[PDB]
Design a protein around this ligand. Structure first.
Ligand code: HEM
Ligand SMILES: CCOC(=O)c1cnc2ccccc2c1N
Length: 289
């Protein structure tokens, strides 16, 4: 099973920058969403979920196929709430129908991260829409009620190591949990990409409680929350070290996240030797737009 990247015919950097810009402009002007969080966080989550289906053992799933457009994956309980990201991207796709679904979904996550003042995420095109019988079964994305051993084992399926895992989890500084979506409630409702996930883990006084859906979560007096899988990053000594490193080094966190997030979005894709170099898109701000 090889998924070879194939550049959308006749497209170049500028074409993709235009799609980036459309997403970013819509992020700016659809700012009311989810009590003024905006769509940034959910678009980051969508990019991660469409990528997180990958299995290194047989090379199935991941972003290449754009199979989130299909009913089985669209309706995965693990993807509850992602329909909002899909709806956001739908007019974007109609404006730029030449882009593959997987390129669009992954590009939305890149754009969201950069537009929320995150690190630049290099991004490669060439994901190709594959048929419905390539859609991965439900159950490939991770549960939140688990411990560090689970997180570590889970992520080995996506060929991620401890540093990559800890880096990627910093995305949980963004957005919030929604009881109706996941059985968890709360979060900072933040839309600026920072290293505050790690600072919060280390600095808050956390109490493990049951929530209204009778799930376990960690709550702070200041009103932040952490999933059991989030908190496992300070229970495990290897993860804790890296948590401390990112809490104390914003630039290192940015750089490591950029690498891990790109890798996440590219898992399962074979890039031929004559493929274009990754693109680094300019923000609206850098374009004076
Ligand atoms: C152990 C792995 C992970 C687990 C168990 C997990 C679990 C969760 C849960 C339960 C939610 C709340 C969803 C809702 O209630 O709407 C959430 C939200 C979120 N997750 Fe994760 N996550 C994991 C890893 C990741 C990764 C690797 C990223 C991206 C790099 C990511 C990005 C996000 C973002 C941005 C949100 C907020 C979305 C919003 O505000 O709508 N997560 N996650
Ligand atoms: C502000 C950083 O710490 C948090 O408040 C926090 C912790 N875990 C989360 C897990 C999922 C979504 C949001 C999350 C979140 N916002």
């Amino acid at each position: 099973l090889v998924h070879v990247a194939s550049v959308e015919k006749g497209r170049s950097y500028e074409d993709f920058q235009k799609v980036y810009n459309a997403i970013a402009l819509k992020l700016r002007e659809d700012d009311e969403y989810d009590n003024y969080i905006g769509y940034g966080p959910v678009l980051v989550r969508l990019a991660w979920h469409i990528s997180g289906t990958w299995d290194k053992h047989d090379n199935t799933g991941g972003s290449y196929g754009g199979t989130y457009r299909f009913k089985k994956e669209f309706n995965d309980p693990s993807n509850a709430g992602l329909q909002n990201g899909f709806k956001f991207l739908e007019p974007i796709h109609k404006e730029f129908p030449w882009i593959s679904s997987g390129d669009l979904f992954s590009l939305g996550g890149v754009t969201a991260v950069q537009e929320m003042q995150g690190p630049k995420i290099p991004w490669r095109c060439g994901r190709v829409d594959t048929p419905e019988d390539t859609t991965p079964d439900n159950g490939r994305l991770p549960d939140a009620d688990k411990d560090a051993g689970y997180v570590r084992t889970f992520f080995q399926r996506l060929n991620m190591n401890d540093r990559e895992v800890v880096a990627l989890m910093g995305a949980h500084a963004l957005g919030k949990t929604h009881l109706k979506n996941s059985g968890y409630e709360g979060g900072g409702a933040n839309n600026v990409f920072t290293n505050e996930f790690y600072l919060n883990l280390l600095n808050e006084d956390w109490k493990l409680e049951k929530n209204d859906a009778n799930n376990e979560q960690w709550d702070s007096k200041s009103g932040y929350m952490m999933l059991p899988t989030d908190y496992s990053l300070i229970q495990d000594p290897k993860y804790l070290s890296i948590v401390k490193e990112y809490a104390n080094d914003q630039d290192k966190f940015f750089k490591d996240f950029s690498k891990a997030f790109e890798k996440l979005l590219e898992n399962g894709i074979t890039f031929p030797k004559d493929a274009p170099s990754p693109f680094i898109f300019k923000t609206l701000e850098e374009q004076g737009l």
